[PDB]
A paper describes a structure:
[name] is a transmembrane MHC class I-like glycoprotein primarily abundant in the vasculature of large vessels, but present in numerous cell types. Since its identification, [name] has been mainly known for its role in accelerating the generation of the anticoagulant activated protein C (APC) and favoring its cytoprotective properties. Structurally, [name] shares a notable degree of homology with the CD1 family of receptors, including the presence of a central and extended hydrophobic cavity suitable for lipid antigens, flanked by two alpha helices lying on top of a beta sheet. The presence of a lipid bound to [name] is key for its biological functions.
In the delipidated [name] structure, the electron density for the Arg156 side chain is absent, which suggests high flexibility (elevated B-factors) and conformational disorder. Moreover, and in line with the lipid dependency of [name], surface plasmon resonance studies showed that loading of delipidated [name], whose interaction with protein C/APC is compromised, with PC restored its binding ability.
Author numbering: 9 to 105, 108 to 177
């Protein structure tokens, strides 16, 4: 009983991005993300959520993408960051038949970059390369409740409750 979410972001430059993503519930594809930042398709393949509730979830995902893009632009603006690049975000929750296991792992240009430590709602480097980019990204992720305790709540409560409601 799990929900997994995958987001791949292709940045031609800091300001133009193409998204490709999907989610699966119990190992079955349930959602698809596709399109440029200006017009991104976000679809549930199965009518799991009622329309008013889905429109709420769709809106939240759109706002996430805008904040994600904002952070990538800020890293570019403050550190040396070379484009084009790809970012992979892999996150979700898994319910043992006890405590849920949740995760959020980020790769850049196919290499491990940062990941979320839910035990303390903190981000760590997954690379051994000491890097102004990695250091600056961590400083931003670890400075805001949105990417700390609020993200832990999304993974530990929202995603788990989605699995509990729909598997
Ligand atoms: C240069 C690589 C960037 C890696 C970005 C990781 C994104 C993790 C979630 C970010 C979206 C939440 C809002 C961020 C607000 C600062
Ligand atoms: C997303 O789709 C890709 C394409 O096959 C697949 O490899 C991956 O497992 C999927 N992930 C999720 C969370 O649905
Ligand atoms: C946005 O994308 C959808 C799906 O590709 C398309 O139907 C719609 O016309 C697009 N809107 C534009 C290009 O303004
Ligand atoms: C990512 O890879 C592309 C080509 O593979 C390169 O042009 C770009 O500079 C790379 N960016 C980073 C941050 O490694
Ligand atoms: C359709 C799946 C899109 C990728 C997952 C986005 C998760 C954002 C969590 C805040
Ligand atoms: C793609 C989002 C699925 C639902 C997350 C609670």
């Amino acid at each position: 009983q799990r929900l997994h979410m995958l987001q791949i972001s292709y940045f031609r430059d800091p300001y133009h991005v193409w998204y490709q993503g999907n989610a699966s519930l119990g190992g079955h594809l349930t959602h698809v993300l596709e399109g440029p930042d200006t017009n991104t398709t976000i679809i549930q393949l199965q009518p799991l959520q009622e329309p008013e509730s889905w429109a709420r979830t769709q809106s939240g995902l759109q706002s996430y993408l805008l904040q994600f893009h904002g952070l990538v632009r800020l890293v570019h603006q403050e550190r040396t960051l070379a484009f084009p690049l790809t970012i992979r975000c892999f996150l979700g929750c898994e319910l043992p038949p006890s405590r849920a296991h949740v995760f959020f792992e980020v790769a850049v240009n196919g290499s491990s970059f940062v990941s979320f430590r839910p035990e303390r709602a903190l981000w760590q480097a997954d690379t051994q390369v000491t890097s102004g980019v990695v250091t600056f990204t961590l400083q931003q992720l670890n400075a805001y409740n949105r990417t700390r305790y609020e993200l832990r709540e999304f993974l530990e409560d929202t995603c788990v409750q989605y699995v509990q409601k729909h598997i």
